[PDB]
Symmetry: D2
Subunit: 117 residues, 4 copies
């Protein structure tokens, strides 16, 4: 599918995160983040087709996950406003990037698995 | 303080209070011989479970009663307990501390070793 | 889809762990673990077909991951001898259990997804 | 004691992360991050005396951890550029905030524990 993938899981429910707001930002020469892409996590807990391979380029991107929206809907008070993931992309070749995050009311753990297709 | 166990709660965002801690030791018969047991304090860390002279090289298993603690808080957990097995003092005496961040249906364990 | 699946990731390299020994046990009335199944992690790092729904029944199952063997092969000495995931299966009814274990030399994180 | 404390640990070595850059920001009226305080992680891996009780305010704050700089000294190529923790401070009243971060080359986990004085 798309080179960029996002998966989110909630510890409290033990079920994949559904209806999650994720925003992708792209670096600019003015040191400002531009709204590269936005999407909503599916009921399966993953987001596919976020960015086309050709559109995806060599840049520093920022990925933000809206922690409050999921926790406010569930009714649990969240400590973090959002989870922010920033990294460089395509240092050498058009390698695919998968972003995985684990959510909790007062903590979160994120990991990225990198594959070369 | 040869061995320390620090336990933290994710949902409450506060250190876990009175989590059952069980420490075992390996035997020649491939059976665990109970070493020590305790309950966590208010700060969440239980200390003094072992003494350096008594603390000896071997394969030790540390059990944390996650089910007993979290069920008391009133929601059903997934893991029956957490087992942290590890050889102790492979090369000389060292200070071992175990950190376990608890959550329903998921947990993470991290250990910090200190040579002196 | 297999009733039980195990996904193992190596945060150190950032790529899924390959050739990881995964052992499954069963609780007995004598408080003794009986080997249920064993396998080796594939290239994708996920194990499928390790158990069948017919054999898979309610009980207390322990999943072992040979972290010490894997990290020794890569040349890194790990703190934990292995990872044990003890849980109760089908307490209420038939459910699909997925085990996710993120590995590290001196730490690990276990996460379960229920379908 | 200290209203804001930060503890950082490395999963690769199982030791406190020494000489790690920590940066604290505060929200302004124009939605611009204004630097508040910054320090280097000590040998024990914890920061003490970063915010004063009077100076610490009820605004929004951000804590940034320079994971990439730490890995460069070790010599391991990291995935993430840095780790950022964004949270509302003093929603109700004075509080003691402790931020704990576990670092890995391609993943990290952050947890927050609060003490009521």
């Amino acid at each position: 599918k798309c080179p960029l993938m996002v998966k989110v899981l909630d510890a409290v429910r033990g079920s994949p995160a559904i209806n999650v707001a994720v925003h992708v930002f792209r670096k600019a020469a003015d040191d400002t983040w531009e709204p590269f892409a936005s999407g909503k996590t599916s009921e399966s807990g993953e987001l596919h087709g976020l960015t086309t391979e050709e559109e995806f380029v060599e840049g520093i991107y920022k990925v933000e996950i809206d922690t409050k929206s999921y926790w406010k809907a569930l009714g649990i008070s969240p400590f973090h406003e959002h989870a922010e993931v920033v990294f460089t992309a395509n240092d050498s070749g058009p390698r695919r990037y998968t972003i995985a995050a684990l959510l909790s009311p007062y903590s979160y753990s994120t990991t990225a698995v990198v594959t070369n297709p």
